[PDB]
């Protein structure tokens, strides 16, 4: 018959492989769309925050430029973390300490944010790796039941078994149709998440540089009054 | 046909391939379930303890918040390790020293915990590695039995070849059912173990910060 | 007949073949464009490193690198070091200046890498799914053949040999599109690796010059 | 045979010549880089065994005096000494040490990248050889189905040349593929070990320089 | 029959022999050294100094690993006699120890390459055997005039055995390789732990001594 009947006319196991593979494709596209809107907003937002903070030259000016970036802004969180380490460390004479303690804090959040961006990447990678193989299982089960069929009665004349071989190869086809988009989407998510982690790393490096420069200039400036 | 029949209906070799691969699938899923509930527990409780220790403005406050956690808790082991390095170093004028030795200890413990979490990953990795070879051996056995069929019958028909090819495809089907879940489960366990080792590392960072901050505030506070 | 072979396939397998031919076209475009760009930039960098290897100081380096034109990378690194010396004027802690310079220069190199690998993702993905798209071509094709043997009865005389021949041509083109993508990507990884290495060596030369000069200046003004 | 393998096709003959060429490249690489590797490793182990007895850096420069101009250890020792001369007059030793290591380790890294030149070829040949072979076989059985379409004589003597050239394609694919990957893996092991040994000699130089700087700076303080 | 197929199969069987030889000899090595190291670590757990550690390990045996690490730290303390900088000694000692462990690691994994490659390329060399065989068979049916494959079927089965042997040679190589990777992992971990103890004791003693002579 045609494709729809060929689905409805196939075995139960092969039916399950096909329905599963279409489901994996559905998940592939849902993941794609939501993470798309997210990453574009956040990436160009962060691009702005980096362009603005590039003028800071101070870290008082950084907190001032970032004074309103939003309560979910990432640069506002990093700047606030450095500031909080300056406030908790009030009274320390060892700057070499503050800087260390500051860096350890900042570089710890970036990675965490990175790890939250890659949450769900397991599904895309796994679907793109597995889907052709689960499909391959669908067809191999199909033609296996077919060859069990041709030695029962036992038949000949290949045109009698051909529907089974068709309805089996459909499973590999569906496996590949679900598999390919998963692979592409995963690759752009890897590269783009890479660029984002890099950009966030650039803002954090600005914060650390400004803080170090302030501690050095204050300590040296009040050493020779 | 059906499954049980397909077994009792087949050769001795494909009988051993089916029993072997079926066993391998059984161990794969058992590992999955026990280590899954365990990992869920460890992450849940650890995240709780981190939330409690987040209020600590001082290392003493951390030891007090962590006083009643658990005899086997991980955060109590880290705080206890810092305490032990402060005690062994008592009287040292080099704080920059203490800090070093402390970090060195803490960030080793985390790594070690990782290797204990991956204590079971060897089986999944190996099952996923050898399942396609055992399946492929089964199928080659099948197609070989087919050509023996065409050697006896001197026929070339489809129905003398059919049993051997059907057996081969059976070996392949079960081969995939044993091979794939081992690999996905192994990778999902790598991903989850990574996240766990990372979280524990974050608590270690809290301990290290509290220690460094306190040592700096004390050394600077008595001068005057 | 090639035209007849093509006319024997299907509309889906047609998309597979034109798609694979397009993908091969884009891979070769990428190869030529980024190849000429990369050779130009590499030869430029080798020239500049050969020149800067003779600078006994940082003033001598800024002088040898006068131009070098503009968009050059070494002038960008030297300018970053200079910018960090100027922002720190009046700081007595030289340990600081040094630290900060490395943090910038190192990171700058990384950014160059990320700008070199922009667009290589295309090659990686094309080489990744090309055999899978070809394979889809062949399985869809052979599926159409077996449906053909299903609606017409008795046996199949010659009818779909060509359909099957065209599916197999789909896999053939799939591999022919896949292989050059992967080879090109690997040469780009190797060459980018060497490039980051050379740029890293120039950055390291700048760092060495800065450290040596600040140390000798501080020591010469630490006794008259 | 020369007439047998040349019989009936262009593309399949071209994959055949390509894969055999790839095998030639793997084995030529094998012999040339083999003699090079054994020579350089022998020389390095000799030099490390000799330098193990130097109680200072000057004793090291004396053990390495005659090592030769192309020798690696003389290059490392010369790098350390040159960093001592460029830093002449600095009161900060904590610095000198740093600058030396950064130089030395990078030299090693550079030699590492100089060892892996050409290993890319082995890696790629072993990587794509089964796939180029697979294309050979798919082209072959495709030519078989073309053969049964022309004559319409069905089986079995017509499919035979196509199946023959297909299995020849797979056979040549494996014969080019396997030695390439095995040789590449031994080159990973050996390049790892050699990079490590070079690291050990470099580490000896760094240690001697640091220890002598400390004993000099501490030696004119109290006495 | 033929020639190549039998040489390929005997090659695979020799590879299986090497698999089992590595299995037994490396088994003895890893068990012995792992036991010795476990004992030495439990004994050095009593160390409150670096001198007490050099003393507990004095007789551990000359080929002992922990005596080599402890002897390296002590030798760095002796070569540095007269240095006022304790932050120096520490560094050099770490650097020294950090080579030691790595070298020992590299020496334990000297043989795993063979198992890895045998298990990787065994099915493919076997596959070459059968593909050469079936190629010889279809070359056979391409002479004279033929049909009815029942004539060449035994040759083809004989070919498929080459792959069977390839896979059967591959499996023990792969399992053995994974087990030896795990054991080397645990071993590198233990050796690293002993080195870490030596480093701590040295650092702590240099700090307490240096702080005692500041007052």
């Amino acid at each position: 018959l045609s494709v729809w009947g060929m689905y409805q006319h196939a075995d139960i196991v092969v039916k399950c492989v096909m329905i599963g593979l279409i489901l994996a494709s559905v998940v592939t596209w849902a993941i794609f769309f939501s993470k798309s809107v997210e990453f574009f907003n956040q990436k160009r937002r962060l691009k702005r925050e980096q362009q603005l903070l590039a003028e800071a030259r101070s870290l008082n000016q950084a907190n001032d430029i970032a004074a309103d970036f939003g309560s979910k802004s990432l640069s506002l969180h990093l700047l606030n973390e450095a500031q909080n380490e300056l406030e908790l460390s009030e009274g320390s004479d060892d700057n070499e300490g503050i800087k260390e303690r500051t860096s350890f804090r900042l570089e710890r959040r970036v990675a965490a944010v990175g790890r939250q961006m890659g949450r769900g990447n397991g599904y895309l990678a796994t679907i793109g790796a597995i889907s052709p193989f689960v499909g391959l299982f669908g067809t191999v089960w199909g033609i296996m039941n077919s060859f069990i069929g041709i030695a029962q009665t036992q038949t000949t004349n290949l045109a009698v078994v051909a529907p089974g071989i068709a309805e089996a190869l459909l499973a590999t086809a569906i496996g590949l149709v679900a598999a390919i988009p998963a692979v592409v989407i995963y690759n752009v998510f890897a590269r783009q998440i890479g660029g984002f982690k890099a950009m966030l790393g650039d803002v954090a490096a600005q914060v650390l540089l400004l803080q170090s420069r302030d501690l050095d200039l204050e300590a040296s400036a009040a050493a020779h009054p | 046909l059906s499954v049980w029949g397909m077994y009792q209906h087949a050769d001795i070799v494909v009988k051993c391939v089916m029993i072997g691969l079926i066993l391998a699938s059984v161990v794969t899923w058992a590992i999955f379930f026990s280590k899954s509930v365990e990992f869920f527990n460890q992450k849940r409780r650890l995240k709780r303890e981190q939330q409690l220790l987040a209020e600590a403005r001082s290392l003493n406050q951390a030891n007090d918040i962590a006083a009643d956690f658990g005899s086997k808790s991980l955060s109590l082991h880290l705080l206890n390790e810092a305490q032990n390095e402060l005690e062994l170093s008592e009287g040292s004028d080099d704080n920059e020293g203490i800090k070093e030795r402390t970090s060195f200890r803490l960030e080793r413990r985390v790594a070690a915990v990782g290797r204990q979490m991956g204590r079971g990953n060897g089986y999944l990795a190996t099952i996923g590695a050898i399942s396609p070879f055992v399946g492929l051996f089964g199928t080659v056995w099948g197609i070989m039995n087919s050509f023996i069929g065409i050697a006896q019958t001197q026929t070339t028909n489809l129905a003398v070849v059919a049993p051997g090819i059907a057996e081969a495809l059976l070996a392949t089907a079960i081969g995939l059912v044993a091979a794939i879940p081992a690999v996905v489960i192994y990778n999902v366990f790598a991903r989850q173990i990574g996240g766990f080792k990372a979280m524990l590392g974050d608590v270690a960072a809290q301990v290290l910060l509290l220690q460094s901050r306190d040592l700096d505030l004390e050394a600077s506070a008595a001068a005057h | 007949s090639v035209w007849g072979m093509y006319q024997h396939a299907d509309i889906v397998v047609k998309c597979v073949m034109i798609g694979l031919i397009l993908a091969s076209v884009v891979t070769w475009a990428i190869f030529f464009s980024k190849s000429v760009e990369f050779f130009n930039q590499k030869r430029r960098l080798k020239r500049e490193q050969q020149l800067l290897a003779e600078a006994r100081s940082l003033n001598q380096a800024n002088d040898i690198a006068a131009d070098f034109g503009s968009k050059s990378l070494s002038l960008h690194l030297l300018n970053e070091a200079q910018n960090e010396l100027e922002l720190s004027e009046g700081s007595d802690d030289n340990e600081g200046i040094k630290e900060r310079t490395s943090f910038r220069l190192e990171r700058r190199v990384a950014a160059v890498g990320r700008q070199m690998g922009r667009g290589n993702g295309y090659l990686a993905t094309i080489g990744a799914i090309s055999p899978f798209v070809g394979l889809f071509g062949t399985v869809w094709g052979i599926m159409n053949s077996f449906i053909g043997i299903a609606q017409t009865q008795t046996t199949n005389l010659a009818v779909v040999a060509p359909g099957i021949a065209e599916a197999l041509l789909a896999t053939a083109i799939g591999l022919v599109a896949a292989i050059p993508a992967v080879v090109i990507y690997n040469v780009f990884a190797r060459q980018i690796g060497g490039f980051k290495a050379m740029l890293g060596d120039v950055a390291a030369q700048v760092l060495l010059l800065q450290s040596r000069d600040l140390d000798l200046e501080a020591s010469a003004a630490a006794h008259p | 045979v020369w007439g047998m393998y040349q019989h009936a096709d262009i593309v399949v003959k071209c994959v055949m010549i390509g894969l055999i060429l790839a095998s030639v490249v793997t084995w030529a690489i094998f012999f040339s880089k083999s003699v090079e590797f054994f020579n350089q490793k022998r020389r390095l182990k000799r030099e490390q065994q000799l330098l193990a007895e130097a109680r200072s850096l000057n004793q090291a420069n004396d053990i390495a005096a005659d090592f030769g101009s192309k020798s690696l250890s003389l290059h490392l020792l010369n790098e350390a000494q040159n960093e001592l001369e460029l830093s002449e007059g600095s009161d900060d030793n904590e610095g000198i040490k740093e600058r030396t290591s950064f130089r030395l380790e990078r030299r090693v890294a550079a030699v590492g990248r100089q060892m892996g030149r050409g290993n890319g070829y082995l890696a790629t040949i072993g990587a794509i050889s089964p796939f180029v072979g697979l294309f050979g076989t798919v082209w072959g059985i495709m030519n078989s189905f073309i053969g049964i379409a022309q004559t319409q004589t069905t089986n079995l003597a017509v499919v035979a040349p196509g199946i023959a050239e297909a299995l020849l394609a797979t056979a040549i694919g494996l014969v080019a593929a396997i030695p390439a990957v095995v040789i590449y893996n031994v080159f990973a092991r050996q390049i790892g070990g050699f990079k490590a040994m070079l690291g050990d000699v470099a580490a000896q130089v760094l240690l001697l320089q640091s220890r002598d700087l400390d004993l000099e700076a501490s030696a004119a303080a109290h006495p | 029959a033929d020639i190549v197929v039998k040489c390929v199969m005997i090659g695979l069987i020799l590879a299986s022999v090497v698999t089992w030889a590595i299995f037994f000899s490396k088994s003895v090595e890893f068990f012995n050294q792992k036991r010795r190291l476990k004992r030495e670590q439990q004994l050095l757990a009593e160390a409150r100094s670096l001198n007490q550690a050099n003393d507990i390990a004095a007789d551990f045996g000359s080929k002992s690993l922990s005596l080599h690490l402890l002897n390296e730290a002590q030798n760095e303390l002796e070569l540095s006699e007269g240095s006022d900088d304790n932050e120096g000694i520490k560094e050099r000692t770490s650097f020294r120890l950090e080579r030691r462990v790595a070298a020992v690691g590299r020496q334990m994994g000297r043989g795993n390459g063979y198992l890895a490659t045998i298990g990787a390329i065994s099915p493919f060399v076997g596959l070459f055997g059968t593909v050469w065989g079936i190629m010889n068979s279809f070359i056979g049916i391409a002479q004279t005039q033929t049909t009815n494959l029942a004539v060449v079927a035994p040759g083809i089965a004989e070919a498929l055995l080459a792959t069977a042997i390839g896979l059967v040679a591959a499996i023990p190589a792969v399992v053995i390789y994974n087990v030896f990777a795990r054991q080397i992992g645990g071993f590198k971990a233990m050796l690293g732990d002993v080195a870490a103890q030596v480093l701590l004791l040295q650092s702590r003693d240099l700090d307490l001594e240096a702080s005692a002579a500041a007052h």
Binding site: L136 | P132, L136, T156, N157, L158 | - | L156, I163 | -
Partner: peptide, 23 residues
Amino acid sequence: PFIDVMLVLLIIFMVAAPLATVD
């Protein structure tokens, strides 16, 4: 990209085994 060898060889035996019969 790896099993594809095994996949295409198994496929080629599913293509060649029907090529075997009859005619």
